[PDB]
Write a protein that binds this DNA or RNA. Structure first.
Lengths: 49, 139, 101, 156, 117, 110, 57
RNA sequence: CAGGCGGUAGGGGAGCGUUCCCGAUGCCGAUGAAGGCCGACCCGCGAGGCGGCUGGAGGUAAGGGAAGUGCGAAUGCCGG
RNA sequence: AGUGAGGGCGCGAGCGAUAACGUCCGCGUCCGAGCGCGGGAACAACCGAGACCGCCAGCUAAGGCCCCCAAGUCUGGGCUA
RNA sequence: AGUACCGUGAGGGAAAGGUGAAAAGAACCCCGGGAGGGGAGUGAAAUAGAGCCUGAAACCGUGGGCUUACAAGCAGUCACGGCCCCGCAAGGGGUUGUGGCGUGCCUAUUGAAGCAUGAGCCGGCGACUCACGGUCGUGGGCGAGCUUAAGCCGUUGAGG
């Protein structure tokens, strides 16, 4: 009934939404919802081959 | 610090006008109708002096004469903005030419307003001032 | 009586009243403590004369206590430009009860 | 919850009923489906037996050093009925302001060891750091077994 | 699971109910635009306590000019007066005194004219 | 309180009914009566009757110098409405809700 | 086609409904019996000035 | 003593209520749970106590854990 | 992690008609993204100036002081009218 | 509630949970055609009264306070003066006439007062997660460190 996680352990960054006051999370439209975009690497793949 | 405005403190004054000159005399008459010069001087009034001037007419011209036209464009639009020159200006409404100077600087709708109220003159010769029976302070 | 010395910016022109002014929290570390303000604007009921000497002569002092504090009122920082955040008016002084002289 | 009863379409997502939306009984509204769904689930947690027992141990250790009742012996209850068991308690000095974890195969021990207060009924070589430090004092019988088990914990 | 934030917002909002004093009909109970109108009022009091300084600046400015000149000479003059003026030169009262102790002003003056020379 | 003149679910109407009481209050049964009775338009009896009970509650279990009962404080309230729907070209739903009226008017003694 | 813009508050609504306002009904007493009679008229009682010819049955 | 402190995108820190899980139910409570209605002591704030009225029974945390959560706002969704 | 397009002003070349609140590039400032205060009437970028919060305190920029509105209808010497 | 109701059929596919502790839920008298309205009794309450618990916002209403017919302004709001209010005073409330200064917020903008837009008003719903792979951090166990599938004990089901 006392031993709270010592140092930091407990949730460190499950930061919700975008900013206390404001909010939005990132850039411009290019990364909307169904927006898991140009994934791992475009020109990097060029290299790959 | 504080320092609140007194109470019904009334003072009037007689101004020559005649001989004196246009604008400048205005600047004067002008600020004269203070609201700032005697104690508790400010927004809600103060002096401004119920000031009245005569011989309003016979004023000296800023050396211009003609080339100074007041306007009255009540105009039902596409009407006339009635251009008028100082000459006749006074000829019929001198007390007014000065007037335009006066309002000229008098500000604030309701207030300044009230001040013109405590601002009266007559290009009449003086007798008018007489009609204003009351005290007769002077300069 | 109504005399003038003033402090931290001219906090004065008075007589014996709890005329609370500025936070000179030094002798405040003790409730009704006392202390002097170097005159400047020496003038009391008929005898009126000089702020030089005010800078250099008699001083006045009070017996004071209390404080005052945060005095409510808030202020929100926003700009049409797209934003807003705000807080409360924190201000005070242990206040003075006037000691003549 | 759409798939099947997904209401295909109903708003002329045309351009006049002013309104947007093609699908009825759609997520974003009226008692329909909700965002990041309350998916049935479970919290597995293979927490390394290493320190797991290491601790069960540590907890046992402190809890006990403050108040430790390694019985090995006890007897007061018709083989262990309530009333008589109680007497025992008064004997073992166990009263109100006390909660102890009764732990071990002395099944007559569990048998009488009910009662919401004072005692908690644990007749198994079933232990756990929690119940451990949470139960005022450890009280247990077949401690030959126990202490030795904990040791097994000690060196595998 | 659950999360009827209701409790909460009904609250946050009445809070707002008060935030809103009882402004001009509609921007009064105006929840939304109420709030808005408020942000306004906010930045406003802002501006307010902010500059009330200059406000006084002037206030006295004139009250006093009023007196100094009423007497003998305007600001360049009078001011400059308290200026040349030695271990004595204060302001947040020039007015005050001009007012309260007619003598007070008459002479702060006297000396001051001299103060300049 | 005093002579209560009020009642529920009768589908007359807000504003108008308010007009009536507007004009009839002030004075007493005598005068406001004459007006409520011989002045034209609906409400007429609705109003009048409400008056009546008011007065009965009055000299009956409030009693007071009957003759001087004068409407004191009063006016109206409207509860729900019948939600009716009509036709208005190219179909479309044209809605309406007639006012089911309740009156809050009190007779006061003086 | 020309649906206003908003509603200058109950404020306005009133401005109007207001100059509107509901006046009251003209009356003196029966030239014959009592009660209220509007100028030229008779009624379910007196009903006349020269021959009731009206009321009671 | 520095010494700085407009500042969205965006990155870091630090707190806030919020309904549940232990709550090692402590209980609190018909001299009210709760939501509500109003208020010139608490908070740098998100919030807090506390006082007064309603209101019919809950509610809950000392410390820590779990999240359908905090919303003008999307010609939004449902009802007025 | 975010912008991956932006504009304005000054100088330096394009271009354009040596036109445009044009568009091309560069050095700088800029303005957004702080650039919320002064300000020039009022005016995102022109001169002043960086606002953590107070003050019924005082010294100053730019740029101002007959009045409308704080501040000499300063003084001195001219020249237009 | 798969019934209302739209569709030709295929097919779509609502809403409405609570009076009170128990019915004692309203004899009876009074305006009235009636509803419904005042009384008596109910009772601990009936602002617990039949759509009838808790029953707030919105909007309309009855009364009271201040306020208003030479006025040009989102808003406001700093100041002050006149009212009225709790007040022991300190003073604290609400109300404003005089004046100073003040382009409303959201989105996407080099760029907004917008004449670009979103925005009818209230209320409840309303959107960066979960599973793993990983990956970097960093809080914790030993350096070789950790354990799936299972067999077994398992109110608590106890972990091995």
């Amino acid at each position: 009934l006392r031993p709270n996680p010592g140092a930091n352990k407990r949730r460190k960054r499950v930061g919700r939404g975008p900013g206390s006051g404001h909010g939005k999370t990132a850039t411009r439209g290019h990364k909307g919802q169904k927006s898991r975009s140009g994934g791992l690497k475009d020109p990097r793949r060029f290299e790959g081959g | 610090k504080t320092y609140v405005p007194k109470q019904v403190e009334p003072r009037w004054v007689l101004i020559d006008a005649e001989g004196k000159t246009l604008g400048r005399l205005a600047t004067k008459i002008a600020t004269l109708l203070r609201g700032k010069h005697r104690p508790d001087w400010t927004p809600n009034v103060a002096m401004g002096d119920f000031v009245v001037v005569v011989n309003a007419d016979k004023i000296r011209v800023t050396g211009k004469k003609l080339e100074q036209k007041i306007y009255t464009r009540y105009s039902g639009y596409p009407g006339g903005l009635k251009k008028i020159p100082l000459e006749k200006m006074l000829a019929t409404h001198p007390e007014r030419v000065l007037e335009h100077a006066v309002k000229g600087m008098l500000p604030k709708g309701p207030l300044g307003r009230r001040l013109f109220k405590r601002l009266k003159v007559y290009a009449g010769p003086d007798h008018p001032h007489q009609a204003q029976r009351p005290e007769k302070l002077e300069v | 009586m109504f005399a003038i010395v003033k402090t931290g910016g001219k906090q004065y022109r008075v007589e014996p009243g709890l005329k609370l002014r500025v936070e000179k929290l030094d002798a405040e570390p003790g409730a009704t403590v006392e202390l002097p303000v170097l005159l400047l604007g020496g003038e009391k009921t008929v005898v009126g004369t000089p702020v030089v000497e005010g800078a250099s002569v008699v001083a006045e002092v009070l017996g004071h206590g209390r404080g005052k504090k945060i005095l409510v009122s808030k202020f929100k920082a926003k700009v049409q430009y797209r934003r807003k955040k705000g807080h409360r008016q924190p201000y005070t002084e242990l206040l003075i009860k006037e000691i003549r002289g | 919850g759409e798939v099947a009863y997904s209401g295909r379409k109903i708003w002329p997502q045309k351009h006049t009923g002013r309104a947007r939306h093609g699908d009825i009984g759609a997520p974003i509204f009226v008692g329909g489906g909700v965002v990041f769904g309350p998916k049935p689930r479970d919290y597995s947690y293979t927490l390394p037996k290493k320190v797991r027992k290491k601790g069960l141990a540590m907890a046992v250790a402190d809890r006990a050093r403050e108040g430790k009742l390694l019985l090995v012996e006890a007897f007061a209850g018709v083989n262990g009925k309530t009333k008589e068991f109680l007497a025992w308690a008064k004997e073992a000095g166990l009263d109100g302001s006390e909660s102890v974890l009764l732990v071990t195969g002395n099944e007559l021990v569990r048998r009488a060891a009910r009662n919401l207060p004072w005692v908690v009924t644990l007749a198994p070589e079933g232990l756990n750091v929690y119940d451990i430090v949470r139960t005022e004092r450890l009280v247990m019988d077949l401690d030959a077994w126990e202490v030795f088990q904990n040791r097994i914990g000690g060196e595998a | 699971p659950r999360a009827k934030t209701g409790v909460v917002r009904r609250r946050k909002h009445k809070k707002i109910l008060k935030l809103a004093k009882g402004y001009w009909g509609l921007r009064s109970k105006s929840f939304r635009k109420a709030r808005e109108t408020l942000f306004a009022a906010g930045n406003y009091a802002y501006a307010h306590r902010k500059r009330r300084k200059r406000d006084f600046r002037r206030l006295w400015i004139v009250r006093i000019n009023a007196a100094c000149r009423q007497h003998g000479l305007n600001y360049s003059t009078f001011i400059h007066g308290l200026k040349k003026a030695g271990i004595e030169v204060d302001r947040k009262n020039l007015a005050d005194l001009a007012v309260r102790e007619p003598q007070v002003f008459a002479e702060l003056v006297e000396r001051a004219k001299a103060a300049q020379g | 309180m005093e002579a209560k003149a009020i009642a529920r679910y009768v589908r007359i109407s807000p504003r108008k009914v308010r007009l009536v009481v507007d004009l009839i209050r002030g004075k007493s049964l005598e005068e406001a009566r004459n007006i409520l009775r011989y002045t034209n338009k609906r409400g007429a009896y609705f109003v009048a009757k409400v008056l009546e009970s008011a007065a009965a509650n009055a000299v009956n279990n409030h009693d007071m110098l009957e003759d001087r009962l004068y409407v004191k404080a009063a006016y109206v309230d409207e509860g729900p409405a019948l939600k009716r729907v009509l036709p208005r070209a190219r179909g479309r739903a044209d809605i309406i809700k007639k006012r089911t009226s309740h009156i809050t008017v009190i007779l006061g003694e003086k | 086609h020309p649906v206003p813009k908003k509603k200058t508050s109950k404020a306005r609504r009133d401005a109007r409904r207001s100059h509107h306002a509901l006046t009251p009904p003209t009356l003196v007493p029966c030239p014959e019996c009592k009660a209220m009679k509007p100028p030229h008229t008779v009624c379910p009682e007196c009903g006349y000035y020269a021959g009731r010819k009206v009321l009671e049955v």
